[PDB]
């Protein structure tokens, strides 16, 4: 036989017949792997990041500004990790560029702002395929090859010299085009292929190669490079695409598309998917949905990160329901880690009022003591958390360990007879007051100076234990100095000896 | 000595931890982290302690266990010494189920016996109890667990391998059977209710088959969705089947000694999580 029920602080007790309470505490083990998370400094700076406002339907926080870019995680991680270059590549990718020169008139802006995102993907991705082919280049035994490896490295400059040293001039000359979109050389560069390519008694395999990087269409053809998807990183053949391959003509994002659409990317490589849903543009949140159910390569606070930036940079378009849907998973897997805290600023980011509304609460109720710490707790209450939920889960925090400013701010009674001393009195009797249980009132009215009927009110509330009964004798003692004949008798019908003892 | 407890409870901020094993007696701890230390022992019942359940703190100090002994006894912690104050046995069996309500709804109770019955004892003004039962299973009731909402309801674990869906109904004032459901061939040892407020409504019904059906409503209207967490019978018979509030991930224990985990993915479908 073995028991388990989850903890209000989600959390597993078992059967466990080796401590000594027979169960077992366990720290449910948190999906959420992520170092810096655990770290408050970080939720600190997150915050200061945002601009919450009060809901249309309810008082309850949730996100009007969000200032969260890809690029701010990055210090937080090595520059050596492959987690390092997801975040890295996304934010070239989505992140907004700025463009810090004024300009004639904005369509320039829009072009620059194109070619400053161009070149620093494709400099990124040389640094990815760098040592790969610097490899390649190690073990070639032919120039013209290596000419082609420079090209690979998108250093055009360097395979424009190697081909003057090679005494392959014209070549040069040739390679120097590389990177200037001109249509020109493009259908003279395919021209050239096809006359090879009809005859051509024989032709270098790799001249061949580079000429078909002039044409601009290296694998969308007829001479093509696509078999070297063998020899290369799915990446490396990208890189040709990006750089050659038409660059002005279409969108960072169709050009991407249009290389996608020629290559199968492996299902479980995450940088992959990051530019299948880059070039996937008009339907990313298809992709993305598609993307959920092949792979995790994408975790739960990535997809919640991606999706948040997108949302709130007019980036790109998702449901509100699957917004909501990262949000909640992520909510939860922090709220797993004892991030509190940090689960409820996630929580905010929810679209449905309602969910939030629930959400908060239950958690800030459940978990008010924590949450009180230092300024980054306090912060934290100081998101936008409802005066009323903070100090009424703090009302109850005080009933379960056995206050009353918040109760100021059926139990009123119950805390009358916990206090059960003057100005206390007045003091609750003005809140009273100030809020406008009626017996209790004239019951003080008569305490800080119709007698007959304050006197009736306060037998009814005795009889609806122990503090009505010491409020009875505090109103017999009150009598009893009031008296020091027919009206006396009237008002006056341990205890019972007392009243023997006045007979 | 405490060779097999049969249930412990944690209250609303975890800090006080109870126990209940064969011996009868209810202990009582301190938990923190390492250490929970022994604050009390208590004896009040003739057999096993089945099961033990906190109220919401907004009712003070309340714990209603249910024993073997075929009664239910409310206890109370009262100045740090507790104190037996109040006892509901209108069940001529073996005791098996105790759970709270929201409490939203009151102070209730759900008590769910052999004798195929399950109640609903409220706490009136005078402290009193209010019983309004009813009957659930032919040849026992082995668990019962609420619902929350926002039109009342819980779920009931038959030994008839049922499992039926209760709402309250103002006309009767008992509340009204209004959806039952089949898919064990043995008795039905846990039911229970998830509290996730979300698009549909989950249940995860373990029972002796090794079977845990997961019961998925669309919504208000359309029945059920019948699905076998996993279409293989476990090593061993199934006891217990909890949710998770933040997460609705589901804890199954088994009676093969570890507590496996269940996270429903984009299938719909369920996958093991740990």
Redesign the interface.
């Known amino acids: 036989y073995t028991f388990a029920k989850f903890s209000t602080g989600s959390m597993l007790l078992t059967k466990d017949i080796v401590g000594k309470s027979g169960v077992s505490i366990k720290r449910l083990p948190t999906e959420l792997q992520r170092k810096f998370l655990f770290d408050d400094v970080y939720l600190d700076k997150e915050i200061e990041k945002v601009t919450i406002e009060a809901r249309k339907s309810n008082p309850y926080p949730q996100i009007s500004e969000s200032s969260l870019l890809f690029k701010d995680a990055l210090d937080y991680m090595e520059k050596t990790s492959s987690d390092y270059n997801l975040w890295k590549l996304s934010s070239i990718l989505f992140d907004p560029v700025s463009y810090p020169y004024k300009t004639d008139n904005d369509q320039v802006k829009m072009a620059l702002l194109k070619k400053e995102r161009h070149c620093r993907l494709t400099s990124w991705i040389v640094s990815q395929i760098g040592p790969e082919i610097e490899e390649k280049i190690r073990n070639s035994s032919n120039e013209i090859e290596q000419i082609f490896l420079y090209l690979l490295l998108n250093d055009v400059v360097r395979a424009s010299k190697l081909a003057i040293e090679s005494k392959n001039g014209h070549l040069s000359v040739l390679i120097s085009y590389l990177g200037s979109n001109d249509p020109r050389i493009r259908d003279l560069a395919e021209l050239q292929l096809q006359k090879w390519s009809t005859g051509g008694c024989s032709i270098d395999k790799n001249i061949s190669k580079i000429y078909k990087l002039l044409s601009g269409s290296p694998f969308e053809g007829l001479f093509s490079l696509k078999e070297l998807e063998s020899e290369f990183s799915w990446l490396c053949l990208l890189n040709l695409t990006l750089c050659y391959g038409q660059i002005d003509e279409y969108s960072l994002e169709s050009l991407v598309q249009s290389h996608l659409d020629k290559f199968s990317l492996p299902y479980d490589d995450p940088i992959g998917v990051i530019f299948q849903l880059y070039a996937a543009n008009e339907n990313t949140e298809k992709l993305y949905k598609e993307v959920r159910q092949r792979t995790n390569a994408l975790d739960v606070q990535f997809c919640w990160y991606l999706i948040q930036t997108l949302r709130f940079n007019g980036t790109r378009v998702f449901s509100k329901e699957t917004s909501d849907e990262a949000t909640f998973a992520f909510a939860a897997q922090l709220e797993f880690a004892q991030l509190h805290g940090h689960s409820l600023f996630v929580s905010c980011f929810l679209n449905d009022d309602k969910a939030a509304e629930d959400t908060i609460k239950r958690l800030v109720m459940r978990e008010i003591t924590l949450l009180r710490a230092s300024t980054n707790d306090h912060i934290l209450n100081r998101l936008k958390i409802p005066s009323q939920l903070i100090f009424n889960a703090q009302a109850l925090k005080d009933r379960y360990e056995g206050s009353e400013v918040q109760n100021l701010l059926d139990l009123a009674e119950m805390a009358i007879v916990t206090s059960l001393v003057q100005n206390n009195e007045l003091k609750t009797l003005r809140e009273i007051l100030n809020e406008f249980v009626s017996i209790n009132v004239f019951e003080v009215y008569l305490k800080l100076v119709q007698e007959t009927i304050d006197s009736l009110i306060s037998g009814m509330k005795i009889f609806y234990v122990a503090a009505c009964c010491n409020v009875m004798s505090q109103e017999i003692v009150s009598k009893i100095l009031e008296k020091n004949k027919a009206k006396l008798l009237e008002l006056p019908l341990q205890d019972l000896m007392k009243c023997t003892y006045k007979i | 000595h405490?060779?097999?407890?049969?249930?412990?409870?944690?209250?609303?901020?975890?800090k006080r931890?109870a126990?209940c094993?064969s011996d009868k007696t209810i202990?009582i701890?301190e938990?923190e982290?390492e250490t929970?230390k022994?604050i009390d022992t208590l004896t009040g019942h003739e057999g096993p302690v089945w099961r033990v359940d906190w109220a919401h703190?907004?009712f003070?100090?309340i714990l209603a266990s249910c024993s073997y002994d075929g009664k239910v006894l409310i206890w109370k912690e009262e100045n740090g010494r507790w104190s037996q104050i109040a006892v509901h046995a209108v069940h001529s069996a073996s005791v098996n189920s105790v759970q709270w309500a929201p409490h939203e709804y009151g102070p209730l109770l759900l008590v769910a016996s052999s004798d195929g019955k399950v109640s609903v004892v409220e706490f009136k003004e005078n402290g009193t109890t209010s019983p309004i039962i009813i009957d659930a299973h032919a040849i026992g009731v082995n668990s019962a667990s609420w619902a929350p909402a926002t039109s009342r309801k819980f779920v009931t674990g038959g030994a008839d391998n049922l499992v039926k869906i209760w709402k309250y109904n103002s006309d009767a004032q008992t509340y009204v059977l209004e959806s039952t459901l089949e898919g064990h061939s043995d008795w039905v040892r846990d039911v229970a209710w998830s509290p996730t407020?979300?698009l549909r409504s989950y249940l995860a019904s373990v029972s002796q088959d090794r079977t845990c059906i997961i019961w998925t409503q669309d919504n208000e209207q359309g029945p059920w969705k019948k699905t076998l967490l996993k279409e293989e019978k476990f090593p061993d018979v199934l006891?217990?089947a909890?949710?998770?509030?933040?997460?609705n991930?589901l804890?199954?224990?088994?009676?093969?000694?570890k507590?496996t985990l269940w996270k429903e993915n984009?299938?719909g479908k369920w996958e093991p999580?740990?």
């Open positions: 405490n060779e097999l407890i049969h249930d412990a409870v944690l209250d609303y901020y975890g931890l126990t094993s202990k701890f938990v982290g929970h022994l703190p907004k003070g100090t407020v979300l006891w217990r909890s949710w998770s509030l933040s997460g991930v804890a199954l224990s088994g009676g093969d000694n507590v984009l299938e999580a740990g």
